[PDB]
Write a protein that binds this DNA or RNA. Structure first.
Ligand SMILES: [Mg+2]
Ligand SMILES: [Mg+2]
Ligand SMILES: [Mg+2]
Ligand SMILES: [Mg+2]
Ligand SMILES: [Mg+2]
Ligand SMILES: [Mg+2]
Ligand SMILES: [Mg+2]
Ligand SMILES: [Mg+2]
Ligand SMILES: [Mg+2]
Ligand SMILES: [Mg+2]
Ligand SMILES: [Mg+2]
Ligand SMILES: [Mg+2]
Ligand SMILES: [Mg+2]
Ligand SMILES: [Mg+2]
Ligand SMILES: [Mg+2]
Ligand SMILES: [Mg+2]
Ligand SMILES: [Mg+2]
Ligand SMILES: [Mg+2]
Ligand SMILES: [Mg+2]
Ligand SMILES: [Mg+2]
Ligand SMILES: [Mg+2]
Ligand SMILES: [Mg+2]
Ligand SMILES: [Mg+2]
Ligand SMILES: [Mg+2]
Ligand SMILES: [Mg+2]
Ligand SMILES: [Mg+2]
Ligand SMILES: [Mg+2]
Ligand SMILES: [Mg+2]
Ligand SMILES: [Mg+2]
Ligand SMILES: [Mg+2]
Ligand SMILES: [Mg+2]
Ligand SMILES: [Mg+2]
Ligand SMILES: [Mg+2]
Ligand SMILES: [Mg+2]
Ligand SMILES: [Mg+2]
Ligand SMILES: [Mg+2]
Ligand SMILES: [Mg+2]
Ligand SMILES: [Mg+2]
Ligand SMILES: [Mg+2]
Ligand SMILES: [Mg+2]
Ligand SMILES: [Zn+2]
Lengths: 50, 59, 86, 52, 134, 122, 158, 135
RNA sequence: CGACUCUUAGCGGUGGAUCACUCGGCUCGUGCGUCGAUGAAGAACGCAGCUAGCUGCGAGAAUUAAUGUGAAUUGCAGGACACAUUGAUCAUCGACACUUCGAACGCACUUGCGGCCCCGGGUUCCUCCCGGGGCUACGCCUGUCUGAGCGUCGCU
RNA sequence: UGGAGCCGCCGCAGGUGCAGAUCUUGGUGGUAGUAGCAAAUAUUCAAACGAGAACUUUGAAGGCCGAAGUGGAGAAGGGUU
RNA sequence: ACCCACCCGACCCGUCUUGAAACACGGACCAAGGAGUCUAACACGUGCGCGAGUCGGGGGCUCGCACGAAAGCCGCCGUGG
RNA sequence: UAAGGCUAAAUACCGGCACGAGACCGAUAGUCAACAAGUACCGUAAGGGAAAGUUGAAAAGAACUUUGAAGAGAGAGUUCA
RNA sequence: CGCGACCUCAGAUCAGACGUGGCGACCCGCUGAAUUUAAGCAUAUUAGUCAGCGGAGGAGAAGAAACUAACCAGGAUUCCCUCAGUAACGGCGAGUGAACAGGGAAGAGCCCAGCGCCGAAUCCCCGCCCCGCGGCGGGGCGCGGGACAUGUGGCGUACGGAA
């Protein structure tokens, strides 16, 4: 909005940190079932806890 | 710098002075959209920033 | 007009993040939740939504105090002692 | 359901009658052999032994 | 049979117990027999295998009478790597092939103090049981 | 290189602080070095220094709190920290002496009419 | 709808009864638990009868039962008074005492005095300390039995 | 008495339940009195109450309360039963002399409902299909 | 023969049935039967050398101490350590620690405004200013201090 | 073909045999390379990059929005665009 | 039993209906799923045991239950039905 | 013998901690959930709520040569496959 | 126009304590439907059942007769078997529906007020010493405070009790 509270800004920050894709060294771990992050949120489609 | 989010400019100023034996003109904080309070810290004109920068490691 | 054009003017919000339960259900005008009833001293739970009841029972969260109490009890609520040292 | 009638209760004489019937045919080599038991070389069929 | 009414004899329970076993418990699981030679000497059937014992592989492809030194113990993978027990990958690089500890025999132990005290404890219990049986 | 709990126990209070400070300094430089690449060899230390820092701080708090409960062991009113936390309810049980207070009437009863060990058929 | 002959019968399954069905899969586990707990209680009350205390003989009420006789709840005060056992003590030697029992007929009274008399004969009161004062029996009748009495103590047989 | 809290009349339902005016609470006023004294002084543990008068509009009562954690109560053995945590909120559970009376329990033919612990418990006993193993 | 269409079979696709597995459920039983103002449950936000999620933890943050264990952890790095030494790694967990909301407590929910005591810079108690620390919810009981009343008396 | 368990007989037990329920869940056709990719006048030439250009970029031309704008800035909302 | 030919026969199933190939509804195709269960009470029939009796519950005595939460036994054997 | 009070035990236990078992289910079943599930996702909100198990004994997961901008191939190799 | 008793009331960031929310399978107190059945429906039934509110404990509640009975009498409470689908209720329709006895599981009984006697013989908090201190207790010593005669403590409570 460009007029944020601090509460909201911090919320957004964490959401922004969560988006990154898996580190590829994770795929090489021993008992690995994970191939892709599957919790990736694109701003244009799917619109936050808000 | 990156600074702890709870800090006042007063605290930062006092920290910067304490750690690096330095002295500050002014501190000028903001908050990164990421979460880490950044701090621009103007040193007083008796001091050169590149000289301290070399002391602390960065360049 | 009742539909698509009127979805146009959903410019402003009813609820926000409640600060007890965390849900986006704190109604700003009422200044209550409607999930935990925030200002209300006691938590809101109802016996009709057994599914809702289960979604934030105890187990659910960290149980950061309660999980070490269970351990403490097990071995006997001993306090202020150590094992025999080396 | 759990309260399906699982257990089944039998008259006591009848239970005894069965147990007498089984004993009586633990004699009878035919009935023992037919029940599969290789009892070919055993010396006597109601096989009783010392009590050491 | 097992009569103790607090043990389990339940496939799912035993396997879960096994695969989700914690390091120190895996140490015990990953044990391996002594050579008849040592079996005579120490009065011990078998020992928890360790980083640099000398060892024969008894079964498999690498089954052989050579005595390779242990290389590492991958307790996560329930396996030990052994000196010349290895295979050339596509691009020439050698790769230490895993052998399960139980399909191996310890010819030479790596004796530290603690390993010494372990062997003293196992031998003593064995001889107590022989005295009780006699 | 290794900072153990072992040795720190005996050390003087001012000496423990200097050590913490000197680790806090060493942590700073590694954090600086993590930004500027540094080297894997440096970026190990950062974990080590952190835990040694904790090892120091821990020893200090254990020493401060041991001394503190020496100081109150005897006094009736003592800080809530130093009072024994068991479980809310368990800190409202009857006192251990208070729940075996017999009424004089009940005591007299136990004196006059004690349950006797007896058997039958002889 | 009823079809040609049968009891015009009323079952009571109109409430939500399946919400209150009470299964009995316990019962074996229960039966054991009682039994352990029973054997423990014996062992605690070491030479004392496992039974409990001695209890009076008593006739049932009503024309129906009338002829039969059970164990009652406890011996009346008159019965203790006549036997000559102090009521407060009688509890301490394993004699049940109720005090709410009247005593109408003298045939039921003298029988119940006789009971207590007989009890007091065949009772082995141990002394408080191993050093032996009055009342407490001889070490002969003590060594020869610190034995429990299995079953109800001096059982009533109609 | 107790008028039925429903808007206007509008106890929508079968005209058995249409009543709103002439109907009467289960507990007594004296119990309500205790319950309120109990509510207010949470630490305090309601022992018992008595009557001190009545206007048309009000009744008056006098609820005896006790600190369970005052040493003089704690150390006196004859009272120290109230300091036990089963006796928290007697009045709320229907356990003072007053609130006992509504429960409808006494020995003898004039009761039977409440021939287990309480009214609810007897119903419970009487409406259990005991379903035995062998039947 | 030609193309196309139909039928059958071979082989290949599409698709994921079947079968075989099962660190999950469902049911019955046993023992115990323990949360919280000494701050619960729950929520939030944090914390990894490279880590997003799940988990684990709390600015001592994938954990500190202690005790038991006795060489690993391991996706890769890097390292430590002398694994003839309180000693890697797990387990236990009694010592220590435990950010912010939350019954939730200085008053407010902006994360805004405060009061009162002490400490360091600031002064040289000059109050300011900055930083740190400790108090500052409501209700209620036992006492304590200060009181109020043409409430009931006494002496003056 | 497949690659790890499975069956006959005598008894017992059952969540035991499908074509349909505008049945449920999943999959696949014909329809079909069909309908369709038509609101608001407009594109053209050369070059560059490049494996590759109707669509990118640069230059040149021709056009439109025509300051109640297809321009220049905010509010709310989004939340890194 | 695969394909083709020819002669004769031959309307599409399910269903409700007096009457369905119907211009009556459901049904593009395939896979898997999918509906007379269990408890209680009664009655009659049948099988077994005992028989003017019969009965087993409930309880108890025998075990840490590996198989047992079985099996066995009870002046409780009959309070009682 | 009411209008005052306390009291263990046999009794209950689809929540909790910790175990044991099964003539149960075997991935459209069994819990919504065998998996980063009360997750993703939807809804202003109360609330709603999925799908999704399996290379192999071992990663030995295809070095190298060659065609192509590449995805894709052709040979070669690993594997008992 | 004072000073002093008490009574009733305030205020303290006064000293020291407690209560607040959670969980909710089981438990205690209230509150309380309507689908439904009756082949319609209104009483009845569904049901003192779901939802609603309150408060607990490891269990809760109950409990030591203002009881049963009508016998040659039993003798607190809870639980099971039975009583019994019985007595009874009921548009006497649908439907509903206990208790005593009897046999078991268990078994345990007690205390006040009052009435009276006893120099309040009682209690709480201070402060000093010795022990003990991670369930704040013992013993001693203080003209150290207060509660209390508008009644604390010992004896005693119907099974009788006192002298
Ligand atoms: Mg959008
Ligand atoms: Mg007394
Ligand atoms: Mg008995
Ligand atoms: Mg009605
Ligand atoms: Mg009355
Ligand atoms: Mg074909
Ligand atoms: Mg599938
Ligand atoms: Mg296989
Ligand atoms: Mg089945
Ligand atoms: Mg089909
Ligand atoms: Mg076209
Ligand atoms: Mg712009
Ligand atoms: Mg019809
Ligand atoms: Mg017709
Ligand atoms: Mg037809
Ligand atoms: Mg026609
Ligand atoms: Mg039709
Ligand atoms: Mg159709
Ligand atoms: Mg099928
Ligand atoms: Mg018949
Ligand atoms: Mg009571
Ligand atoms: Mg699946
Ligand atoms: Mg599947
Ligand atoms: Mg499923
Ligand atoms: Mg499958
Ligand atoms: Mg598959
Ligand atoms: Mg499959
Ligand atoms: Mg194959
Ligand atoms: Mg509460
Ligand atoms: Mg009707
Ligand atoms: Mg009808
Ligand atoms: Mg109607
Ligand atoms: Mg009713
Ligand atoms: Mg309810
Ligand atoms: Mg109770
Ligand atoms: Mg009474
Ligand atoms: Mg009775
Ligand atoms: Mg009958
Ligand atoms: Mg009724
Ligand atoms: Mg008196
Ligand atoms: Zn909320």
């Amino acid at each position: 909005s460009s007029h944020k509270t601090f509460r909201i800004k911090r919320f957004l920050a964490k959401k922004q940190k969560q988006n990154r894709p898996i580190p590829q060294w994770i795929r090489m771990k021993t008992g690995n079932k994970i191939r892709y992050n599957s919790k990736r949120r694109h701003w244009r489609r799917t619109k936050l806890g808000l | 710098f990156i600074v702890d989010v709870k800090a006042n400019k007063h605290q930062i100023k006092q920290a910067v002075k304490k750690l690096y034996d330095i002295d500050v003109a002014k501190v000028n904080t903001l908050i990164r959209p990421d979460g880490e309070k950044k701090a621009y810290v103007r040193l007083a004109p008796d001091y050169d920033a590149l000289d301290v920068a070399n002391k602390i490691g960065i360049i | 007009t009742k539909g698509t054009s009127s979805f146009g003017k959903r410019r402003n919000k009813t609820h926000t993040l409640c600060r007890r339960c965390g849900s986006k259900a704190y109604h700003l005008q009422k200044s209550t939740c409607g999930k935990c009833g925030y200002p209300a001293k006691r938590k809101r739970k109802y016996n009709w939504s057994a599914k809702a009841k289960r979604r934030n029972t105890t187990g659910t969260g960290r149980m950061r105090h309660l999980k070490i109490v269970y351990r403490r009890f097990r071995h006997g609520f001993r306090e202020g002692t150590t094992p025999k040292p080396k | 359901k759990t309260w399906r009638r699982w257990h089944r209760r039998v008259n006591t004489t009848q239970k005894r009658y069965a147990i007498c019937s089984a004993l009586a045919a633990s004699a009878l080599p035919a009935l023992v052999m037919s029940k599969g038991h290789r009892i070919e070389e055993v010396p006597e069929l109601p096989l009783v032994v010392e009590d050491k | 049979m097992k009569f103790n009414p607090f043990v389990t004899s339940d496939r799912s329970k035993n396997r879960k117990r096994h695969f989700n076993a914690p390091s120190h418990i895996r140490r015990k699981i990953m044990s391996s027999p002594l050579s008849k030679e040592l079996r005579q000497k120490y009065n011990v059937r078998s020992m928890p295998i360790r980083k640099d014992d000398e060892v024969q592989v008894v079964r498999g492809h690498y089954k052989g009478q050579q005595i390779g030194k242990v290389v590492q113990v991958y307790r996560k993978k329930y396996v030990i790597y052994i000196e010349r027990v290895q295979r050339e990958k596509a691009n020439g690089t050698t790769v230490h092939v895993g052998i399960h500890p139980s399909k191996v025999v310890i010819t030479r132990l790596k004796l530290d103090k603690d390993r010494k005290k372990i062997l003293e404890r196992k031998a003593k219990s064995r001889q107590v049981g022989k005295e009780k049986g006699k | 290189a290794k900072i153990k709990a072992r040795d720190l126990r005996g050390k003087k209070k001012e000496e423990l602080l200097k050590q913490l400070d000197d680790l806090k300094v060493e942590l700073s430089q590694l954090r600086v070095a993590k930004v500027t690449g540094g080297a894997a060899s440096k970026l190990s230390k950062i974990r080590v220094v952190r835990k040694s820092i904790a090892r120091v701080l821990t020893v200090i708090n254990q020493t401060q709190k041991e001394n503190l409960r020496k100081f109150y062991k005897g006094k009736k009113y003592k800080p809530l920290d130093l009072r024994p936390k068991k479980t809310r309810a368990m800190r409202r049980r009857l006192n251990k002496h208070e729940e075996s207070l017999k009424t004089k009437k009940q005591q007299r009863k136990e004196r006059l009419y004690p349950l006797r060990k007896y058997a039958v058929k002889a | 709808a009823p079809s040609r002959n049968g009891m015009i019968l009323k079952p009571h399954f109109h409430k939500d009864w399946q919400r209150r069905v009470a299964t009995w899969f316990n019962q074996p586990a229960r039966k054991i638990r009682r039994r352990k707990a029973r054997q423990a209680r014996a062992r605690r009350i070491a030479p004392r009868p496992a039974s409990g205390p001695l209890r009076p003989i008593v006739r049932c009420p009503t024309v129906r039962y009338h002829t039969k006789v059970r164990a009652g709840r406890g011996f009346s005060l008159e019965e203790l008074r006549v036997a000559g056992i102090h009521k407060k003590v009688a509890r301490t030697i394993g004699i049940s005492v109720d005090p709410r029992r009247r005593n109408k007929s003298t045939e039921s009274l003298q029988a119940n005095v006789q009971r207590l008399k007989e009890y007091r004969s065949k009772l082995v009161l141990f002394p408080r300390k191993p050093s032996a004062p009055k009342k407490g029996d001889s070490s002969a009748e003590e060594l020869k039995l610190a034995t429990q009495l299995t079953g109800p103590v001096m059982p009533i047989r109609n | 008495g107790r008028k039925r809290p429903v808007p206007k009349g509008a106890t929508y339902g079968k005209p058995v339940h249409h009543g709103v005016n002439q109907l009467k609470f289960a507990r007594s006023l004296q119990s309500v009195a205790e319950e309120r004294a109990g509510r207010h002084c949470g630490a305090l543990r309601v022992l018992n109450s008595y009557w001190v008068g009545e206007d048309s509009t009000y009744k008056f009562f006098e609820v005896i309360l006790i600190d369970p954690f005052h040493k003089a109560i704690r150390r006196n053995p004859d009272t120290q039963w109230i300091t036990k945590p089963v006796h928290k909120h007697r009045e709320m559970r229907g356990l003072t002399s007053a609130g006992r009376k509504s429960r409808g329990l006494g020995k003898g033919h004039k009761f039977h409902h409440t021939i287990g612990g309480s009214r609810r418990a007897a119903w419970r006993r009487r409406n259990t299909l005991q379903l035995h193993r062998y039947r």
